[PDB]
Design an enzyme around this catalytic site. Structure first.
Site, PDB file in Angstrom:
ATOM      1  N   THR A   1      50.760  52.161  28.346  1.00  0.00           N
ATOM      2  CA  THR A   1      50.268  50.832  28.688  1.00  0.00           C
ATOM      3  C   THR A   1      48.747  50.723  28.711  1.00  0.00           C
ATOM      4  O   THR A   1      48.228  49.609  28.821  1.00  0.00           O
ATOM      5  CB  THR A   1      50.830  50.387  30.047  1.00  0.00           C
ATOM      6  OG1 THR A   1      50.531  51.368  31.044  1.00  0.00           O
ATOM      7  CG2 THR A   1      52.331  50.177  29.974  1.00  0.00           C
TER       8      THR A   1
ATOM      9  N   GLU B   1      68.555  38.290  36.092  1.00  0.00           N
ATOM     10  CA  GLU B   1      67.352  37.709  36.677  1.00  0.00           C
ATOM     11  C   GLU B   1      67.618  36.331  37.265  1.00  0.00           C
ATOM     12  O   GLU B   1      67.112  36.003  38.343  1.00  0.00           O
ATOM     13  CB  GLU B   1      66.242  37.634  35.628  1.00  0.00           C
ATOM     14  CG  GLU B   1      65.659  38.976  35.238  1.00  0.00           C
ATOM     15  CD  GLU B   1      65.442  39.890  36.426  1.00  0.00           C
ATOM     16  OE1 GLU B   1      64.789  39.464  37.398  1.00  0.00           O
ATOM     17  OE2 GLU B   1      65.919  41.042  36.388  1.00  0.00           O
TER      18      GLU B   1
ATOM     19  N   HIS C   1      44.123  45.223  16.381  1.00  0.00           N
ATOM     20  CA  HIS C   1      44.288  46.369  15.500  1.00  0.00           C
ATOM     21  C   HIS C   1      44.423  46.003  14.028  1.00  0.00           C
ATOM     22  O   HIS C   1      44.640  46.896  13.206  1.00  0.00           O
ATOM     23  CB  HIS C   1      45.491  47.205  15.944  1.00  0.00           C
ATOM     24  CG  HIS C   1      45.203  48.098  17.111  1.00  0.00           C
ATOM     25  ND1 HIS C   1      45.676  47.845  18.380  1.00  0.00           N
ATOM     26  CD2 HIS C   1      44.467  49.229  17.204  1.00  0.00           C
ATOM     27  CE1 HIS C   1      45.257  48.790  19.201  1.00  0.00           C
ATOM     28  NE2 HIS C   1      44.521  49.641  18.512  1.00  0.00           N
TER      29      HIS C   1
ATOM     30  N   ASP D   1      69.828  48.300  43.498  1.00  0.00           N
ATOM     31  CA  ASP D   1      69.834  47.248  44.510  1.00  0.00           C
ATOM     32  C   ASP D   1      70.796  47.569  45.646  1.00  0.00           C
ATOM     33  O   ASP D   1      70.490  47.321  46.816  1.00  0.00           O
ATOM     34  CB  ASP D   1      70.195  45.906  43.871  1.00  0.00           C
ATOM     35  CG  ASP D   1      69.102  45.368  42.976  1.00  0.00           C
ATOM     36  OD1 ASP D   1      67.941  45.779  43.136  1.00  0.00           O
ATOM     37  OD2 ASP D   1      69.400  44.531  42.105  1.00  0.00           O
TER      38      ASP D   1
END
Ligand SMILES: Nc1ncnc2c1ncn2[C@@H]1O[C@H](COP(=O)(O)OP(=O)(O)OP(=O)(O)O)[C@@H](O)[C@H]1O
Ligand SMILES: Nc1ncnc2c1ncn2[C@@H]1O[C@H](COP(=O)(O)OP(=O)(O)OP(=O)(O)O)[C@@H](O)[C@H]1O
Ligand SMILES: [Mg+2]
Ligand SMILES: [Mg+2]
Ligand SMILES: [Zn+2]
Ligand SMILES: [Zn+2]
Lengths: 379, 379
Positions: free
Chosen positions: A49, A249, A168, A322
């Protein structure tokens, strides 16, 4: 040499680092009003990253020397001593340590703690480090006066990916049919390192045919070469996997909006964004402990797992994480609000409550997923 | 001197090597658009398939020098230094290393890593190596910048075998009754080295009788001489072994077509084709981890072993490898989706599921095997 113009999709992280650049350019402006700077800063994020690139861009925006060492190369105590002496002799400078989790065997750690306590911050000296395994670090490094600031670096979204492709290709000749916006929409899950390798593959396809420009067909063929075969480097989210993630989500968002004590929702996305979504605890949250708000928090935390079971009859690894967090919260509830049999029934009751909410609001859940599958993010 | 006209049954491998030939003929065409070539390339395959011949054909298609060394001959560090200096003095050239697993004792390995980092790729220099034991190589050789491209070389099929026979009889007088297509159908399991030795035996039979042509009877008698006796060199698949192999391959295809999450099937054959089918891991696959798709993958992986037990009541060594891979996948499932007793029952349930599918679709399984026993491959 690099600067902040060579970085894409890191607006929030670059915002926090503006303070460091100003301090290194003129320390006296901070000293005259008694503003005290931290001695160390930690960068945390997944591999590829751009944590090493961000540190080098700080030393470019301010023309200061850059002394660095790598933690994977670890006589150890002597090397640490040499590095800090160089930085002191050149007052405003930077010390950078990479893979600090590898080195932070007992003699090297002790020497580092001695060096952190022995230099004067008012001279214009600061230390930086990076890692992708922050939860195995020694607690002695994180005490006040050593490493007390943390900055999170995230994977890019659709607009972030498009910016990196432009950085790039600015020294390469492109044909008139190339549309970098369409290429960005076809690579969800890629990071900056993956995108930089994709541009090189498309250039090899053009050069092998003797051409002097890169066409749109070269880019599309390069995608298939990097994700399959004996020499593969990258992973992307397929259309089938996309549908299951969207329902997970949206399940969190609907349950939070319905329970009275749930928190407001500001954003939904297919790409993870926070430090909790990335799986970190960071060695770290209410003043008052109440039964009604603790039960509402448990129910919303099981919203993603409930939508998977009602719509598909499946379970993912995110839903298994979760369920493990919920059991820890319930265990602390039993010992504070007035044993294993008691913990088990609290979690079971919360799970049943979430499933009924999903059934009753199924229509709204479907509408949100459709918009998410086309835009990828709702702000 | 050899070129690509001396190679048979390696179309896919020759396709990947076209890029190398173009680069060696004119490096400037790659440099002017910033296309960066790998520094090393690895060829992997079973013995006798032509890995050394492919490397020599690359140096023939482009008229460049060819410097080579053999890893089985291993003063060691000095020899490596000499070889790389010769290649630099003649800019566009090739360095070839054979049996790299033998040499990749600690001083020789260190020198090789120094040489790989110290030469400039833009000059037109490239390094190649070959092996048939890729899984014992040192991980330091495979890091980025050293050996990051792999090419797989496979055993030939029926049409590949016929081409090799034609290459090695183009300078020999043949009678009018010779049918090289019938000879190809009778030698499944042979590799190029076996086929080249078979042509020499048929010529010795004709010369021993004073004749000046090779007849069809010479070829048929040569087959029996090379597979039996005190001086035997080759192995072939007999008609009895062929039937068991066909049922194993068709068992994988039927189970994949029936489970909802199984992958589509594009080819079935009696000869192995991929790097997984050849038994390599190559030091190497989905973005999302799900319970339903992991169980479907386990069931299809036991399809070959289930057809053997239902039809013959037997078990082969390929089926024993499959059971070992399944246990590794199940073990990772337990630790990610929520111990030894738990792993054992997951594998047992998947095996029972596959056996029921085989019984219910027995008619379709029989029909596929009949076509395979006559054509050897279904595209
Ligand atoms: N945001 C970005 N913009 C442009 N290039 C990027 C970006 N992020 C990563 N890269 C590319 O990633 C390559 C290597 O990544 P980098 O070393 O900076 O990341 P990292 O997080 O430190 O990685 P690692 O965990 O491998 O050490 C760099 O050459 C840079 O070209
Ligand atoms: N595809 C082919 N076409 C023609 N001849 C072949 C082919 N494959 C192998 N041969 C023959 O194989 C003989 C030796 O095989 P070769 O050394 O090229 O293979 P290899 O994979 O490097 O073997 P090894 O593991 O024994 O080193 C060569 O003389 C060549 O005649
Ligand atoms: Mg790095
Ligand atoms: Mg050989
Ligand atoms: Zn969740
Ligand atoms: Zn099998």
């Amino acid at each position: 040499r690099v600067t902040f113009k060579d970085v894409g999709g890191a607006e929030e992280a670059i915002e926090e680092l503006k303070e460091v650049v100003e301090f290194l350019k003129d320390p006296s402006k901070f000293n005259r009003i008694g503003a005290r700077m931290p001695k160390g800063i930690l960068l945390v994020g997944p591999p590829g990253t751009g944590k090493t690139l961000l540190a080098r861009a700080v030393a470019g925006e301010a023309n200061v020397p850059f002394f660095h060492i790598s933690g994977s190369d670890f006589v150890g105590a002597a090397r640490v001593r040499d590095l800090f002496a160089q930085a002191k002799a050149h007052a405003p400078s930077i010390v950078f340590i990479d893979e600090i989790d590898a080195v932070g065997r007992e003699q090297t750690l002790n020497q580092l703690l001695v060096e952190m306590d022995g230099f004067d911050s008012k001279e214009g000296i600061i230390v930086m480090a990076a890692t992708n395994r922050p939860d195995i670090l020694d607690p002695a490094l994180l005490r006040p006066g050593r490493f007390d600031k943390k900055i999170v670096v995230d994977p890019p979204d659709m607009l972030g990916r498009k910016k990196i492709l432009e950085i790039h290709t600015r020294n390469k000749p492109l044909a008139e049919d190339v549309n970098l916006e369409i290429i960005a929409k076809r690579t969800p899950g890629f990071v900056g390192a993956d995108l930089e390798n994709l541009v090189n593959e498309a250039a090899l396809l053009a050069a092998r045919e003797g051409r002097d420009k890169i066409t749109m067909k070269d880019f599309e063929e390069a995608i298939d070469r990097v994700i399959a075969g004996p020499a593969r480097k990258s992973l992307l989210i397929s259309p089938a996997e996309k549908r299951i993630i969207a329902y997970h989500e949206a399940g969190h968002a609907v349950v939070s909006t319905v329970v009275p004590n749930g928190e407001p929702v500001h954003r939904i996305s297919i790409i993870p964004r926070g430090y909790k979504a990335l799986g970190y605890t960071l060695h770290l949250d209410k003043y008052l402990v109440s039964r009604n708000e603790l039960l509402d928090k448990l129910t919303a935390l099981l919203g993603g797992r409930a939508a998977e079971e009602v719509v598909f009859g499946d379970v993912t690894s995110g839903a298994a994480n979760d369920i493990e967090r919920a059991t820890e919260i319930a265990r602390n509830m039993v010992s504070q609000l007035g044993i294993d049999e008691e913990v088990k029934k609290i979690v079971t009751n919360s799970y049943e409550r979430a499933k009924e909410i999903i059934r009753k609001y199924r229509k709204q859940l479907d509408n949100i997923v459709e918009i998410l599958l086309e835009k990828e993010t709702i702000e």
